[PDB]
From a paper:
The RAS family of oncogenic proteins is important as therapy targets because of the frequency of activating mutations in almost all major cancers. All family members function by signal transduction to the nucleus of cells via interaction with effectors (such as RAF, RALGDS, and PI3K) that catalyze phosphorylation of downstream proteins. When KRAS is bound to GDP, the protein is in the inactive state and becomes activated by nucleotide exchange from GDP to GTP. Mutant RAS proteins remain in the active state and hydrolyze GTP at a much slower rate than wild-type (WT) RAS.
We used these analyses to design of cross-over compounds linking the common diphenyl-anchoring moiety of PPIN-1 and PPIN-2 to the Abd-7 aniline fragment. All three compounds showed very similar binding modes to Abd-7 with van der Waals contacts to K5, L6, V7, S39, Y40, R41, D54, I55, L56, G70, Y71, T74, and G75. Ch-1 was found in four of the six KRAS169Q61H chains (A, B, C, and F); Ch-2 was again found in three of the six chains (A, B, and C) and Ch-3 was found in four of the six chains (A, B, C, and D). Thus, by combining the anchor constituent of the PPIN compounds with the aniline fragment of Abd-7, we generated a compound series showing good electron density for the entire molecule when bound to KRAS pocket 1. Each of these PPIs was inhibited by the Ch-3 compound in a dose–response assay. Furthermore, the BRET interaction signal between KRASG12D and either PI3K (α or γ) or RALGDS was inhibited by Ch-3, demonstrating that the BRET data are not restricted to KRAS-CRAF interaction. The most potent compound appears to be Ch-3, which invokes an almost complete reduction of phospho-AKT at a concentration of 10 μM while not affecting AKT protein levels. The potency of the two of the cross-over compounds (Ch-1 and Ch-3) is improved, relative to Abd-7, as these show IC50 at 72 h of 5.3 and 4.5 μM, respectively.
Numbering used by the authors: -3 to 167
Write the structure that this text describes.
Amino acid sequence: YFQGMTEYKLVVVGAGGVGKSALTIQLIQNHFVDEYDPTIEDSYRKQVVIDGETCLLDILDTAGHEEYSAMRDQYMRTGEGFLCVFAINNTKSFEDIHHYREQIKRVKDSEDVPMVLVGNKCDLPSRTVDTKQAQDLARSYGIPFIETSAKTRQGVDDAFYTLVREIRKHK
Ligand SMILES: Nc1nc2c(ncn2[C@@H]2O[C@H](COP(=O)(O)OP(=O)(O)NP(=O)(O)O)[C@@H](O)[C@H]2O)c(=O)[nH]1
Ligand SMILES: COc1cccc(-c2ccc(Nc3ccc(C[NH+](C)C)cc3)c(OC)c2F)c1
Ligand SMILES: [Mg+2]
């Protein structure tokens, strides 16, 4: 019996400065943050309609700048889907994607975890990671790829809605 809308727990991960907070704030508040305020841990919530189902997104915005924590491994255990964010103007953040995915596969103890690869800052000219390289990486993991800009709002909704669609396929 129906007790309230379905709830989805999403975690946004990736290197420091790629725009994990900017994406989330752009989703919740329709606001671009220009200042860079390093995050330890922040939680958000938004109601949306995706494919005709109303649902509640519980979103955890993580830190990039983290050494081993057991607080960290706890939220990777509870979270049902992951946005893996890199910045298209920072090749190191792209190479770090592999580390985030391994860390997740290890704690969930599973090959098949709902994920979306997100290449942020596609508004900047400084592109050092090619769209094709990222699509290939995503195809090799069997997951979707979305190019976003927290500044222009391109792909922001799509990134979160796509993740929810992946979580739905998984069950
Ligand atoms: N041009 C442009 N700048 C962006 C974009 N996304 C974020 N930024 C900028 O990049 C900086 C870092 O954004 P922020 O959201 O703090 O990154 P983060 O991944 O949350 N950082 P942290 O991991 O330390 O919490 C900020 O100045 C922000 O304005 C984007 O899509 N385009
Ligand atoms: C521990 O791991 C995760 C992984 C992914 C998501 C959440 C999560 C993230 C957010 C909320 N809930 C929440 C979010 C924002 C507020 C803000 N407040 C001012 C209304 C309150 C509750 C939540 O509650 C059940 C959450 F569970 C937790
Ligand atoms: Mg952040």
